[PDB]
Design a protein around this ligand. Structure first.
Ligand SMILES: Fc1ccccc1Cc1c[nH]c2ncc(-c3cnn(C4CCNCC4)c3)cc12
Length: 281
């Protein structure tokens, strides 16, 4: 730790949570192991308010070099703040810790799939709108997500959707064992392995379809190897039963083969809020 560059240590100070400011309960995991080694934690703010947080131990980091890079992804993610983007509370420098806010209702896909929950069509569109706003912010910062899907969004106690699975919050589902999301990828990303905000617009289109089917798997009868040919033939996900026609038109524009022809996230926010506003609640 003393081995780290001093002007780099000074640059990460505003991201670092001191050991006296955080209580990690290493005896209690969040989400029955489904999200890896993620623990309940208590973060104390400057006024001593207790913040319930989710603490992840970053076991993949060992050497000085990897610590230094992690400090940089920390500085960068700490500048991203938006009501629809999962914030980084800070980092702890035992393995490095990533401190994130606690998301009461876990991931958006699991929440909508749960038989007990009954979101209305308006509630579902509202979640889509929230994602679109989170993405509009990321795109305004020229940040390409590359893995947008309903499983990669979180829901807090106020039912506020947070775009997650990026920066230090990536590899969300990395589970330990003892012994490419091609169905969300834009057609040009499947062909070139490159990602843009226009490829994120395609993935948002798929997430919208996931929201409207309450988390059904896209293209269940099509192999990931066959997705490219299926998309080149002009075949697309079909209109979900309870999905309004103007919203399905929004999903379709998202899956246009010409990247430049797809809506921008700013346009998607405009169109979805206009659609959301036609529902009583
Ligand atoms: F580990 C990560 C690593 C990187 C990014 C993101 C994450 C995930 C995460 C962050 N903050 C969280 N806060 C709560 C829950 C969670 C999981 N399950 N539950 C609930 C338990 C009762 N049943 C309904 C779900 C809540 C998960 C997370």
């Amino acid at each position: 730790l003393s081995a780290l560059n001093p002007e780099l240590v000074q640059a990460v100070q505003h991201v670092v949570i001191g050991p006296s400011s955080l209580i990690v309960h290493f005896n209690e995991v969040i989400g029955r192991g489904h999200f890896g080694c993620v623990y309940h934690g208590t973060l104390l703010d400057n006024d001593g308010k207790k913040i319930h947080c989710a603490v992840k131990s970053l076991n993949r980091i060992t050497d000085i070099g990897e610590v230094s890079q992690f400090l940089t992804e920390g500085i960068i993610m700490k500048d991203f703040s938006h009501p629809n983007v999962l914030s980084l509370l800070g980092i702890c420098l035992g393995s490095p810790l990533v401190v994130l806010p606690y998301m009461k209702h876990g991931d958006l896909r699991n929440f909508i799939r749960n038989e007990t929950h009954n979101p209305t069509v308006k509630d579902l569109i509202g979640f889509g709108l929230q994602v679109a706003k989170g993405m509009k912010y990321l795109a305004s910062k020229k940040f390409v997500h590359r893995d947008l899907a309903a499983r990669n969004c979180m829901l807090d106690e106020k039912f506020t959707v947070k775009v997650a699975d990026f920066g230090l919050a990536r590899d969300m589902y990395d589970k330990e064992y003892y012994s490419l999301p091609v169905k969300w990828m834009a057609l040009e990303s499947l062909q070139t392995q490159k990602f843009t905000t226009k490829s994120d617009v395609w993935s948002f289109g798929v997430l919208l379809w996931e929201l409207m089917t309450r988390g059904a798997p896209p293209y269940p009868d099509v192999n990931t190897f066959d997705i490219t040919v299926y998309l080149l033939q002009g075949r697309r996900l079909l209109q979900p039963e309870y999905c309004p026609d103007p919203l399905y038109e929004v999903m379709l524009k998202c899956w246009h083969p010409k990247a430049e022809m797809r809506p921008s996230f700013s346009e998607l926010v405009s169109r979805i809020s206009a659609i959301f506003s036609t529902f009583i609640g």
